Symmetry: C2
Subunit: 58 residues, 2 copies
């Protein structure tokens, strides 16, 4: 889960870098923020939950 | 789908590689990542996933 959380944050960040700032959905930006915080608390299992929501907004 | 997993996996391997000392990045990783990116550009997303598996296997 630790590697999947880090890989998923990298994957979401890469998608966001290609989008126009106004074209980044608010739901995507919030979900990624939650994932990065959950990673910071070592809750890698929850990080994956937040990452699922982020990808829904792609 | 495979298209999304291919892009996500390339992004994930690139971020892992950026954390390593350059001398610790094996030639086997570099070749596999190059193949994954070429296959992605050709729409061969299933083959890209295979090359990404080789790349991640070669990481320290």
């Amino acid at each position: 889960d630790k590697a999947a959380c880090a890989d998923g944050i990298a994957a979401v960040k890469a998608r966001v870098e290609k989008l126009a700032p106004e074209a980044v959905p608010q739901k995507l930006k919030r979900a990624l923020k939650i994932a990065e915080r959950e990673q910071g608390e070592g809750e890698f299992d929850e990080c994956l939950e937040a990452l699922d929501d982020a990808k829904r907004a792609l």
